[PDB]
Design an enzyme around this catalytic site. Sequence first.
Site, PDB file in Angstrom:
ATOM      1  N   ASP A 253       0.819  -1.194   0.000  1.00 38.39           N
ATOM      2  CA  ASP A 253       0.000   0.000   0.000  1.00 38.39           C
ATOM      3  C   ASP A 253       0.863   1.258   0.000  1.00 38.39           C
ATOM      4  O   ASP A 253       2.046   1.229   0.199  1.00 38.39           O
ATOM      5  CB  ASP A 253      -1.053   0.048   1.099  1.00 38.39           C
ATOM      6  N   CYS A 287       2.709  13.147 -18.187  1.00 38.40           N
ATOM      7  CA  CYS A 287       3.998  13.226 -18.901  1.00 38.40           C
ATOM      8  C   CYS A 287       3.800  13.394 -20.388  1.00 38.40           C
ATOM      9  O   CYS A 287       4.677  13.879 -21.095  1.00 38.40           O
ATOM     10  CB  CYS A 287       4.858  12.006 -18.538  1.00 38.40           C
TER      11      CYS A 287
HETATM   12 ZN   LIG Z   1       4.180  10.426 -15.752  1.00 30.81          ZN
END
Ligand SMILES: [Zn+2]
Lengths: 347, 347
Positions: A253, A287
């Site tokens: 986790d 990104c």
């Molecule tokens: Zn990324």
Amino acid sequence: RPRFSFSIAAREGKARTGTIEMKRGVIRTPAFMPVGTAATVKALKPETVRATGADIILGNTYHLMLRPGAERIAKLGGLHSFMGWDRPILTDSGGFQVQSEEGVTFKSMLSPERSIEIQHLLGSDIVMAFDEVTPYPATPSRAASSMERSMRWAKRSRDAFDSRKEQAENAALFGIQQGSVFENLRQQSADALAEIGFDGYAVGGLSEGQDEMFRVLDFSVPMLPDDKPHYLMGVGKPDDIVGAVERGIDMFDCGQAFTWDGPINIRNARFSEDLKPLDSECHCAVCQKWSRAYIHHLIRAGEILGAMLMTEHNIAFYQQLMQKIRDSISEGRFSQFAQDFRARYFA
Amino acid sequence: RPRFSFSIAAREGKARTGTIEMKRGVIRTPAFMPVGTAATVKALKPETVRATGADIILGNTYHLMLRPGAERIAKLGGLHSFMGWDRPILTDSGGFQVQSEEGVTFKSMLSPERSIEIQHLLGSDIVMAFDEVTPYPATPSRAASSMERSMRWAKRSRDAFDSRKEQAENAALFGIQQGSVFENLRQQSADALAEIGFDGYAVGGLSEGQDEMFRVLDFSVPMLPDDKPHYLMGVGKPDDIVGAVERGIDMFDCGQAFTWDGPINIRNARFSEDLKPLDSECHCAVCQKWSRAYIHHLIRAGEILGAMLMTEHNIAFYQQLMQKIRDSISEGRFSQFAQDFRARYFA
Ligand SMILES: [Zn+2]
Ligand SMILES: CC(C)(C)OC(=O)NCc1c[nH]c2nc(N)[nH]c(=O)c12
Ligand SMILES: CC(C)(C)OC(=O)NCc1c[nH]c2nc(N)[nH]c(=O)c12
Ligand SMILES: [Zn+2]
């Protein structure tokens, strides 16, 4: 789909890759679970969580029982419906965030029975036994006394879960190994949990330093039943995940941005005019569309969109890590992956 | 597409509906412009802004010049590229957020020339002239002196913009009417701006009370050239928009959730177990997927997702309002729409 089925498809040393099938979906292992603290994964819509590759998320029993309340969430239809995540949810028991043999009372009660009941009211797919978590460091006497209480509470958890037919039929129950850093206590705990029988086994009480954690995992994970999932609670650095998988763990986790060359702090002035994405190879939507320079600006300005973009990237990086782990184990090249990962992450 | 073309497709009384065509896209009028304070529309990705129906957003010259800086944004490729919004952007001049005849210096310079230059560096599609904004209330003498300076600054703005060939060829320039609440000063200002000539005309200095604003709009908007867009700056309540459109305005800028029965404050305890969406008829993604009860919880818990969901709903409500306005004007039933809107919004 069954209530619960864990299948191991491939192994490399102690590492395994496979699937947990449950009524709400399949979980690919090794798995990383984003954490939904107060019925939300921070700054992300559930659809965005899913788009990063997450198969399951974690909910915190302690926080949900305080706000908005467990009975309230049940009346509104359960946690899945409330937050709009329809895939599996694992709930912790509350033993970390929160004394006597009956349980604990605190200011903003929990007991094995009430913890299991809360997790039922939330509609959790994977329920955690209620444990007593041992501070670190612990003397052997204290670690022993504490582990023994946790095994008594594990049996009470098992009995509570089983007494609730809808829960027993539709959810899974995991037990939690205790024993601090002591091999004999970890063995006693593993033995006790296996005698009670669970659908999966967590290693609790770790997360001291990495060397020490890895030494404890070296002897503790082989003690657990091989044919059930192994969950290391509370351990989430990328390096820690790679080495824990090397020792037989299946589940984990959850300004800092992860990259394959190591973490960066995007607030640093060196990023103020950097037009590159956060990471050069990352396939995430952030990104693809935004620069380091923009995210730098957003985080320094306190803008919510900065939190949104950083969290989506980081979760997507974690899921890419898990995918690379799974593929490398299935392809029998996980040792090589681990070596390559470290030489670059720490270059 | 042309640099700038405004076409009126339909009229009803003083109300108009039509299109502004620009190189980066078409703007449907009457238009509502979400505000992107520090190069972000709060809590929304640009794709989410677009999905609500927005055709154009507003950027604040004052805030961007302070952080991250105008020259920095130009070096990074301009505001569109930096924030990932590829459609038109209108920038304000800074006259509201910020003394002498040359301009103003302040602590965190602006002049007609430097404001136009900053808007150029940002790559704005619609550039606002730099004005002196008159406090309310204003004596007639003060309002007059101030309006006269603004008209001198409007000519300097025009000359600055035109001296920059890339800006002159690719962007539009709007002038700003001043004059406080005085009919003769508003007339003088309209006349001056029309003599200089602009691509569009804003009514500045308003936003006193609604009755007073509407009285000033009654005589001020007919003074502006009919064939160019009319922008009311700083006015965004739903009722104010409806009545401003009734008086000839084409453009507007941006726990409370808007509904067709009036605003609600989602933090109120009455919403804690309300499974209905924010609004019963709203077509937005938030109203399709999440309850009032969940959003209540999120906002009370301080969670970022609550801000995200509230902002997407509110912007989507505004764009639905604008669409209903446009369709009703084109269909010759805007009077009826306005009446129906008010009887329910204020029921
Ligand atoms: Zn990324
Ligand atoms: C702080 C120390 C090192 C003592 O414990 C841990 O790191 N413990 C790890 C942990 C995280 N969440 C848990 N939930 C439960 N029920 N039990 C646990 O042991 C844990
Ligand atoms: C506070 C008072 C009522 C005096 O002014 C306004 O409400 N003014 C409205 C306004 C908003 N943004 C603007 N930008 C510029 N350049 N000029 C303006 O007049 C305005
Ligand atoms: Zn909505």
